[PDB]
RNA sequence: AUAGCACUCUGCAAACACGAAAGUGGACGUAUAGGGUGUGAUGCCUGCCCGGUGCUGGAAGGUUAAUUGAUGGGGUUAGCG
């Protein structure tokens, strides 16, 4: 709905939020919750390996069933829930046998709906089928790359892929990056779009909003001294060099992919 | 420094970073996501130049490193005068 705050204070002048009503307001299911700790972007040597990471609100991890192993048993959707660990909403599923699991809620799914996984499952949003049994021209999410590993592609809010063709052992899909790639037919996928497609319309409005999410401020390369950065130094403001990273890698147009193993699976590049 | 904006890279065993390796962070995340760079609420806006350096794509035309080893020349070695 794009709710906009009124300018009572300078920090609230440019605050705009997405509002959703169907979300469950209680606590998450305890049996499917475990503790997660902050890392600060440091590895097991104690050094910083990713910059601009720190602080943030305390969070719990939710165990999400990306695999969807339970096959043939129908499940009913209990509720839709907010998830701090991801931009998409999650859905609680109850199976006939009574087992409860979490899944990535597709767009439009609500409490009381029916979902299933298997080769013979009906073609409705939230149903998980092998790519072989999928109609051409379908819009899919949570695509799997390795048999049994689970969904890896098209998981963020609003994500989707287009199934263009399946001939022989391979199916061609267009990804949201604009690339066309081929996948083994026996890899599974899910029907429909993933919810919360308005997430990218949000406007944080102030620095504290990012500090809450755990992003430390970014210092430009020009603001440092020569010992710190290739961009550092000079009397006044001056660039004087082709832009590069702190470790010397050109940052404008230089390609970096080097994996030759999977080059076959790429039909048409996004034209990077 | 900041919220906002824009360029570029990354299809996941991701890019990037630490390490001598094992491995670890990125992330128990998956292009509405992650890294690098510049500008810096908002309003109106953001002209010309690809000659130079860089980057991206193509061309297969000239130059050749290891490698391989044609041919030639030389030392010594036999027998003859």
Curated annotation (Swiss-Prot):
Belongs to the universal ribosomal protein uL2 family. This is Large ribosomal subunit protein uL2. Keywords: Ribonucleoprotein, Ribosomal protein, RNA-binding, rRNA-binding. Pfam families: Ribosomal_L2, Ribosomal_L2_C. Part of the 50S ribosomal subunit. Forms a bridge to the 30S subunit in the 70S ribosome. It comes from the Bacteria. Residues 37-56, 223-255 are annotated as: Disordered. One of the primary rRNA binding proteins. Required for association of the 30S and 50S subunits to form the 70S ribosome, for tRNA binding and peptide bond formation. It has been suggested to have peptidyltransferase activity; this is somewhat controversial. Makes several contacts with the 16S rRNA in the 70S ribosome. NCBIfam families: rplB_bact (TIGR01171). The keyword Membrane does not apply. GO terms for molecular function: rRNA binding; structural constituent of ribosome; transferase activity. GO terms for biological process: cytoplasmic translation. InterPro entries: NA-bd_OB-fold, Rib_uL2_dom2, Ribosomal_uL2, Ribosomal_uL2_bac/org-type, Ribosomal_uL2_C, Ribosomal_uL2_dom3, Ribosomal_uL2_RNA-bd_dom, Translation_prot_SH3-like_sf. GO terms for cellular component: large ribosomal subunit. Residues 228-238 have a biased composition (Basic and acidic residues). SUPFAM superfamilies: Nucleic acid-binding proteins, Translation proteins SH3-like domain. The keyword Cell division does not apply.
């Amino acid at each position: 709905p794009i709710q906009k705050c009124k300018p009572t204070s300078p920090g609230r002048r440019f605050v705009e939020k997405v509002v959703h009503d169907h979300l469950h307001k209680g606590a998450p299911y305890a049996p499917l919750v475990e503790a997660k700790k902050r890392t600060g972007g440091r590895n097991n040597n104690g050094h910083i390996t990713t910059r601009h990471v720190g602080g943030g609100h305390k969070q719990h991890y939710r165990i999400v069933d990306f695999k969807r192993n339970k096959d043939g048993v129908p499940a009913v959707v209990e509720r839709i829930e907010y998830d701090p660990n991801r931009t998409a909403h999650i859905a609680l599923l109850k199976y006939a046998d009574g087992e409860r699991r979490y899944i990535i809620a597709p767009k439009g799914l609500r409490a009381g709906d029916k979902v299933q996984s298997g080769n013979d499952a009906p073609i409705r949003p939230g149903n998980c089928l092998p790519l072989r049994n999928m109609p051409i021209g379908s819009t899919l999410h949570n695509v799997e790359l390795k048999i049994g590993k689970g969904a890896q592609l098209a998981r963020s809010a609003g994500a989707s892929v287009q199934l263009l063709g399946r001939d022989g052992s391979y199916a061609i899909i267009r990804l949201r990056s604009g690339e066309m790639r081929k996948v083994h037919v026996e890899c599974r996928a899910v029907i429909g779009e993933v919810s919360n497609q308005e997430n990218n319309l949000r406007s944080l409005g102030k620095a504290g909003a990012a500090r809450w999410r755990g992003v430390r401020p970014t210092v430009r390369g020009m603001a440092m001294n020569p010992i710190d950065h290739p961009h550092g130094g000079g009397e006044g403001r001056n660039k004087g060099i082709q832009p590069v990273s702190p470790w010397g890698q050109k940052a404008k147009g230089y390609k970096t992919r080097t994996n030759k193993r999977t080059t076959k699976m790429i039909i048409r590049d996004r034209r990077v």
